[PDB]
Design an enzyme around this catalytic site. Structure first.
Site, PDB file in Angstrom:
ATOM      1  N   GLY A  10      24.538  -3.369 -32.200  1.00 16.52           N
ATOM      2  CA  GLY A  10      24.312  -1.886 -31.363  1.00 16.52           C
ATOM      3  C   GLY A  10      25.236  -1.378 -30.703  1.00 16.52           C
ATOM      4  O   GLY A  10      26.159  -1.480 -30.517  1.00 16.52           O
ATOM      5  N   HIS A 174      24.639 -15.664 -14.370  1.00 19.71           N
ATOM      6  CA  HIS A 174      24.362 -13.916 -14.619  1.00 19.71           C
ATOM      7  C   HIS A 174      23.562 -13.210 -14.228  1.00 19.71           C
ATOM      8  O   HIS A 174      22.546 -12.574 -15.610  1.00 19.71           O
ATOM      9  CB  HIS A 174      25.580 -13.334 -16.289  1.00 19.71           C
ATOM     10  CG  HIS A 174      25.234 -11.789 -15.797  1.00 19.71           C
ATOM     11  ND1 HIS A 174      26.169 -10.682 -15.362  1.00 19.71           N
ATOM     12  CD2 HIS A 174      24.493 -10.525 -17.309  1.00 19.71           C
ATOM     13  CE1 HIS A 174      26.010  -9.787 -16.424  1.00 19.71           C
ATOM     14  NE2 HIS A 174      25.287  -9.304 -17.064  1.00 19.71           N
TER      15      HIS A 174
END
Ligand SMILES: NC(=O)c1ccc[n+]([C@@H]2O[C@H](COP(=O)([O-])OP(=O)(O)OC[C@H]3O[C@@H](n4cnc5c(N)ncnc54)[C@H](O)[C@@H]3O)[C@@H](O)[C@H]2O)c1
Ligand SMILES: NC(=O)c1ccc[n+]([C@@H]2O[C@H](COP(=O)([O-])OP(=O)(O)OC[C@H]3O[C@@H](n4cnc5c(N)ncnc54)[C@H](O)[C@@H]3O)[C@@H](O)[C@H]2O)c1
Ligand SMILES: NC(=O)c1ccc[n+]([C@@H]2O[C@H](COP(=O)([O-])OP(=O)(O)OC[C@H]3O[C@@H](n4cnc5c(N)ncnc54)[C@H](O)[C@@H]3O)[C@@H](O)[C@H]2O)c1
Ligand SMILES: NC(=O)c1ccc[n+]([C@@H]2O[C@H](COP(=O)([O-])OP(=O)(O)OC[C@H]3O[C@@H](n4cnc5c(N)ncnc54)[C@H](O)[C@@H]3O)[C@@H](O)[C@H]2O)c1
Ligand SMILES: O=C(O)/C=C\C(=O)O
Ligand SMILES: O=C(O)/C=C\C(=O)O
Ligand SMILES: O=C(O)/C=C\C(=O)O
Ligand SMILES: O=C(O)/C=C\C(=O)O
Lengths: 308, 308, 308, 308
Positions: A10, A174
């Protein structure tokens, strides 16, 4: 030539193939679940090779057997968030995808270093280490390089200086609780506080933490990919070329910073053997307070993972 | 295309042409006093262009008229030292050469930025600003980038890390009294003291200061050129591309650090306008003591210059 | 620094920004009619600079005023085709878009070289020249570099040789009637016919002519962009760095090959002045018949255009 | 990382290290019989890495043991010629040096591809193959890439086109009898004869054949090294990155072109296996007569060699 397999073709995966091809680091295999897509992208990028001059074979596939014997595996098969979502909101869909991808690729490339990208990063990286059974140093997550990159960019913009002279460490999961470290941020070895006022620097730390979300709200139907792919590519490069880079990556902790049994964003020396060393920085009380709050957001993440 | 003239086609000048050609920054003019030499080197390098793929015209010449309208002038016509000599020992021969070169090129390229390299660097740079009458910000000396480069190299070697993650500021005259600044030295924003023991770091500061001499004693019949040319090239690039680099270059002081009317190695923002800003760092007593001793070595240098 | 405006921040446009930024050729302005999208992609690409090391300002916008005074203008605002469509089927929609884009951008950058990408390429390029009122040699279309890139890739794959040693000329409109030239195809100077059997070479020629449709079928939701962007970037580079590249582009003809008043794929010398010279190859009867069929096709799109 | 040993740290050798290091293809070992010189050049080149950003270990030495297990071995230990000399005049001195170098280096790196540079090239390459006992396809000489580089440069200059779009094949011994091939010379696939008038092209051919002597006369104290090193580096790169480059090199013949038992400049496919295939071009009578005169010359050097 070296072999690099990118699971998930992607935005982040294809863009990662782009940065890697240009670097002529090794042949690239773009794999996806959707038919045609990875074949189209890989051929399209391969067709750019005469223009740019790089000799790297870029092949698209839907067959995990093509990824066999890879030197590095990049995982970008996860679904991205849309505006109004958190990276944690993707943990259910992405835990399934991640387990599926790792269980199939890992066995075919036993000596490979796996670089996770799927969000929530820290949790997905833990999952990959579990599903693969690979030594922990050979299973890492990309997050720090990207976060610190956004950070360094805002600093260069603010100080009106070259992005090539800005360095900055950033730790933690994160997510919203990531810890950009102004005290460990410099311009040609000079503390950034010498270039930016504290209030302005505070706004930069904040923007950094919400960096991903800023892009999401702009793109509207997607998530960032240029910087993410660059970050991932730099890590692949560090391994393939054994550059001994000092960077923040999601690594497996066994006591460092008083944290055990978790993948967390920490400074490491990245080389041919993957995480060859985790650095233990002399953080102060304020820094540790922020880090602990981050280690807590991550653990929360792992507990959710457990119930899936 | 941009135009770059390199006065003096010896080791540093030709090697500087090499780094610059590869970067395809602009056409290059290699000038020398000796006949044939600059023509041979420039043609030889030009003949490499089909192999490397850069489209930059590299012409050798003995006629200053060919350097007219340059965007940047690099001066590497000075004689190099041999083992047992100091850079200061060359001040007489090089003051003459420098005056000669500047008086001829400067008038032909009024809008150019001049980058001095001839040693003793700080004095020769002062001389060039005097002989040319160019605004002081458009007349600078290359020294800091090189010195800090040797410094950064020894640090990467010692810490076993990538040279791409090491930053370090270094100030003062380009001589034995140069001031490498450990406190302004970092690895991905992390103080180098976290990677190297003080005693080892002391030996690195020392080796750095004597770096040039180390090469001289190895080459036996010449002086360093690879790192010097790289340093010079990076500065030319900063100007031509207006990169706003933060680096240590010999700039003209008018009060900064309590120093006036001298060219001295200080941190600056280098761009299209040359020195666009001189940075005033909060050095401590020990650092200032070292800097002052350096500013004194330089002034001594300027006083010798005066009697020539 | 040089200024480059990209109108249409979609797949090709954004990917061009990526190739361009990596070359550090100048500041990039990404414009789009959709709010947020360009800003997001620009910021994301900008945030990658600290990782890659390039100092380029990439800004996204929805305001043409921000494109003012550009050195080069890239037009990639056209709607792409979906499987089962011909590039010509896009003529009505893209004629409106192209007209809108040119009329707003041209006036603001009268000294810029306009590089068209929108399909149908040849007809849209002609429309741009017409709407901008610019000198014909400063309004060109990208097509041949891409088409030849595909052709050269297939050749490299088939022959088993570096894509760096493969040159191939190809002319005609950017469509099915496209004309690759085996006779004008070499590998390190040697005719490809010496490497690839006639039947196989004929297959490569056919694949080249339909190389675009091939990708559209694999992607299903869009058309190629990695090679298209690499080609568009190489042309921008040719102009800004005045490289004098010998490449096929859509240039305005006035009798060459016996064709007049039409933008058509022909080999040209590309430099700072845009199309600096149109090469006139001594094509045989076979080649000319093919070329004429292609010209007939392009002419047909123009008749359609002139009736919109 | 890959390991590359360069025997003879003089002009060509050191410059090769420079081109190589910049490509970050592997660690480099610079060896020389003169103490200090290699160490100095290696250290100086090493100190440039922080500026350029490449992580390559460049080490100088006077001990062959340090070259053990190299992937590639470059031999540049031969004495160069001075004006008024022919490369063949160096056969006696360089035969001894070459023999000494090969016998010490070959055994330590039995799996390395040996790339000879020492003049007279063709004869020295043959001597290396003989002394190393290595497989003929793993002992090659650099010459054609350089010769063709000069030829291609002159073509680009004369035609006024990018050196990136110029391909040209050339064969024969590396000497006066050298044979460039206009018929096998193209610009983006188009014959050069279409760009350069016959008389002018003939001049370019003659200049190519004497391109080396031209430089020696301009330098007066030595021979070319920038292009020679760029060529030698491109070959090393071809091997290490398995690029399958189509280039002319001195390869061992067994009947091709009607020549047997002789190293001669011929077009080959260069990859990880060294000379992977020797191309056999359909040369006409004109070309073959020239080729045979060249073969006659090379054969003569071999007769001289075999009698040393
Ligand atoms: N760690 C970071 O710093 C960082 C940065 C950016 C994005 N991300 C995350 O990376 C992931 C990818 O983002 P994206 O924008 O590229 O998404 P995307 O939706 O464009 O691409 C994901 C690709 O994965 C493929 N896929 C799905 N299931 C698969 C399976 N089982 N096997 C193989 N391929 C499969 C899809 O078909 C799709 O082409 C997301 O989870 C995103 O949140 C992380
Ligand atoms: N600033 C730094 O960090 C740094 C680094 C390296 C060397 N240097 C200095 O740079 C100078 C060059 O070093 P080098 O090793 O290249 O020396 P070199 O002797 O190889 O080259 C100098 C060249 O200048 C030419 N020359 C002499 N007089 C000239 C004149 N009037 N006009 C034009 N050309 C003239 C010579 O003929 C010679 O080719 C030396 O003074 C050296 O000490 C400074
Ligand atoms: N000539 C070639 O060789 C070549 C190669 C590839 C694609 N193309 C063509 O290029 C065009 C772009 O392809 P894509 O895949 O990038 O498409 P895309 O749909 O991804 O991107 C087009 C962008 O144009 C924008 N846009 C529309 N109207 C606009 C206006 N008035 N002003 C500013 N922006 C506007 C859209 O909002 C969109 O972001 C298509 O027409 C396609 O057929 C040509
Ligand atoms: N084949 C080509 O296309 C080509 C191009 C250029 C130069 N050359 C040839 O390459 C050779 C080198 O040229 P140069 O200009 O670099 O010369 P140079 O004199 O600068 O360097 C040769 C180096 O070899 C070293 N040396 C001598 N004997 C040695 C031994 N036994 N072991 C290890 N090192 C030893 C010397 O000390 C010296 O540093 C010459 O023979 C020259 O004619 C060939
Ligand atoms: O915001 C996101 O979803 C992805 C980019 C990132 O992880 O920073
Ligand atoms: O040592 C020298 O003379 C030159 C190199 C330097 O200035 O460091
Ligand atoms: O086929 C398309 O629509 C786009 C790619 C091309 O024009 O080649
Ligand atoms: O002429 C020489 O001796 C070296 C350069 C070459 O061989 O071309």
């Amino acid at each position: 030539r070296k072999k690099i397999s990118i699971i998930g073709a992607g935005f982040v995966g294809s863009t990662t193939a782009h940065w890697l091809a240009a670097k002529e680091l090794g042949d690239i295999v773009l794999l996806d679940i959707v038919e045609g897509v990875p074949q189209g992208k890989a051929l399209d990028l391969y067709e750019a090779s005469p223009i740019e001059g790089f000799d790297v074979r870029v092949t698209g596939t839907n067959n995990y057997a093509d990824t066999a014997n890879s030197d590095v595996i990049v995982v970008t098969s996860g679904a991205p968030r849309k505006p109004g979502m958190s990276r944690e909101d993707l943990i259910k869909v992405n835990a399934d995808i991640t387990r599926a991808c790792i269980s199939q690729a890992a066995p075919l490339s036993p000596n490979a270093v796996i670089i996770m990208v799927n969000n929530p990063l820290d949790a997905m990286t833990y999952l990959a280490a579990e599903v693969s059974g690979f030594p922990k140093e050979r299973v890492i997550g990309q997050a720090g390089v990207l976060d610190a990159a956004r950070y360094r960019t805002f600093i260069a913009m603010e100080a009106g200086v070259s992005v090539q002279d800005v360095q900055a460490m950033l730790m933690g999961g994160h997510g919203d609780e990531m810890v950009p470290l102004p005290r460990f941020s410099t311009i040609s070895g000079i503390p950034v506080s010498e270039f930016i006022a504290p209030d302005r620097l505070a706004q930069i730390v904040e923007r950094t933490r919400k960096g991903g979300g800023e892009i999401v709200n702009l793109l509207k139907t997607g998530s960032a990919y240029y910087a993410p792919a660059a970050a991932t590519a730099q890590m692949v490069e560090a391994v393939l070329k054994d550059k001994k880079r000092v960077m923040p990556v999601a690594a497996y902790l066994t006591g460092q910073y008083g944290l055990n049994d978790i993948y967390f964003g920490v400074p490491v020396i990245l080389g041919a053997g993957g995480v060859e060393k985790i650095l233990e920085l002399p953080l102060n009380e304020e820094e540790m307070a922020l880090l602990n709050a981050s280690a807590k957001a991550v653990r929360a993440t792992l507990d959710t993972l457990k119930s899936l």
